[model samples]
Target chain A: TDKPVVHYTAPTPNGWVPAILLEELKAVYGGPDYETVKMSIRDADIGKVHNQVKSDWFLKICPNGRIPAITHEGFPVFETSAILLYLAQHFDKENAFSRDPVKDPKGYSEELQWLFFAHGGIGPMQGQANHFNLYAPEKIPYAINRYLNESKRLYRVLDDRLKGREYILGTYGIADIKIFGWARIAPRTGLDLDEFPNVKAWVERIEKRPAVQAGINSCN
Target chain B: TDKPVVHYTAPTPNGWVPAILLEELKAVYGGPDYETVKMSIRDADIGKVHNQVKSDWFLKICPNGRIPAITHEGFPVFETSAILLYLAQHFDKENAFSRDPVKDPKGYSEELQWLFFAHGGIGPMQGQANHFNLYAPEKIPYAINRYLNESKRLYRVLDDRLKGREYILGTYGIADIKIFGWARIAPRTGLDLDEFPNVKAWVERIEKRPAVQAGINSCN
Candidate 1:
């Protein structure tokens, strides 16, 4: 059997998402055979390593030229959410990290809902927060506040959704995995988890998971 | 046998996405069984229809409290990309707007990649442009330029991807539909479609489809 391979490295949240997910998939599938091929993000001028991620070879596999793509049976899959779903659909045979659509359509749809929420909402907004709050050269308050407030608003949305639930959906699945990749780094964007008590609790809950902990260190 | 009901209205790109996909599905299935339940986005106190989209009732269906949700046989699905995938998987029996995973795994994975690109990249960046350039109470050049530059960058990415290609993937699929919902409105965001010739041509091509034309006028 061909082992799954993930192309990734840290400093890019998108890179971390799929690595964590592969760990979860490995645990669910009863093995730890996944391999991670680290891809560099530094500029060529740095001299230590080339920016291999932007090379034509990488772009052929991922047109977007981003990391955290995977290869299953030699077929490449990019997009963090798509790779997560591919791994779950193909490897999580027992539905350990995902819901079975045939068995529970509503639950499956709920899982999809939160996954897209993270993809479309939390991920982008928090990314902006990171750019303005930490990475921007000018320290523009308007740009910083725009994303910071929006990031907090999205956090509150997640907080409210988790008011009475342990996870974003009925069970801890790929949805949680997708959101945790960013939500765990909220403090880096100046977001105090105290304002979002439910999300904080949820993060603590996911932090304790064996797969999440193991996946968090995959690149190291 | 059950008709799918879409909760949506005009003026929301997210809402337009699924409605257009449903129209595509109906055209493929050779029926008009899809139903759209009009939901208001305005506040109640101004003597207008109460904003059911933000109400607790709707929040239960979509925790994000957004439009473009659907209910099929009493099971609710939200998130524009997710809704489109759900409809395609359930209704696009002829593969009119989706790639069959079993028959063509690479094509199916390509479809997912672009779908998530639109969801996580194009949709949110363009939405930010709308907020900063058009809807913001204060005129902030930094904020406006930030989003507009990002939107243009994303458009160029699409243009490059569409080089020598008619659709996003091997054929017309949901990825085209998802991006079209926003790309069709490029002018409203002050984007000169001429800069991205391939995307402009794509929009023109999609505009000619009967289902796409009907979906554009869905609310009206």
Candidate 2:
């Protein structure tokens, strides 16, 4: 079967972003069965499905071995934004998720802006915050503070931007969906969202979505 | 008044990508009118206009500052993709080059893939490759060869993907503009594109555009 298979590990912000999209799109497609598997980096050493990144079979699917990645049809695809975009296009054939930009140019560009904002800005900066705040073997205050301040600052930027719009595009779409996973993890990453009302509001709105809620339950 | 204004610096792969986009967009937007300014990282210490990143003025315009950035209509923008995406959106309002994937669900999704491919894959991987290939103060062959091999591998993956598509999106869109800049400098960056025939062919196609031809002239 040409069904796209999603291989994933959970409790990770990057992992959840695509997982949510796949769940949303799979329901939208109602075909192309989607599967989510939680694997370990430790298991990566023993050559599990996660370890398949190094294997010929998986590389044939995605030459780049990163997870929260997927195989669409027979081809392998990776990278969060890349996977999310592919799924959105595949399932949003009827504009179910509002991925179209021209009919809603401002909204679409706004979506692109925030999507890039997450990857290009918040996601990367916060990932650094994670490394410094929690993961790094030894603490480097400069790096930790630098990333935390930046991450906090980034959430504030989003908070301010979300002041009026319900979603990044003023309509809930992939743009909003893509950032939801990260938003959910922000406080856990050590940045308090309460200080940023708009961002907090947006997160609350995302939490209310039935599909998004179901995605969390199933994927978890 | 309609001239393109580029706030730029001496060539870096990241810096040059927008220079390339302006070249492409200018063709469709009438002739390109852009000015190039030389900026020094040292000046960032003194807080000059070129050093705007350090000042509130820059944050007022662009929240981030790392050079090869741009401005439009008195508003400042940073991040290579932000500028590239904005240019494509502004100039190709009619979906001439390609539509915004966010606004147009399908096209927006396609644009997102290429953009993420650049950011998540090529940008980070190739950047590290440069650290090992050119920028590292000392030669750590392990790191150097590791990144170089990976960089070349990525080139191959993209080349294979481009086997038949005229451009990444089947039309010259912002994604092509983003890829073309770095692919053109593969040789200078100490990577080879000749082995990746599709990438080389796409590079050549981009090189032949009248606007691309004109835009590159000013880089030096």
Q: Which residue pairs overlap in candidate 1's backbone? A: none
Give the winner by TM-score: 1
Task: Give the per-residue lDDT of model 2 (tens digit) for A139-195.
Answer: 656556757887887787777668778877666677677778788888888878889
Q: Kindly list the per-residue Cα lDDT of model 2 for residues B1-220, writing each as its tens digit.
A: 6655656644666667777776666666663467765444444365655443445545555544445566665545566776777677667556766675555655665565667767766765576567667865566565566557767877877887788887887878778877777788787667777788888889998888877766566556
Give the lowest summed-lDDT range of ten residues in model 1 chain B: B42-51
Best by lDDT: 1
Candidate 2 has an lDDT of 0.67
Evaluating just chain A, the predictions reach TM-scores of 0.91, 0.85
DockQ of each: 0.72, 0.31
The TM-score, computed over Cα atoms with residue i paired to residue i, of candidate 2 is: 0.70
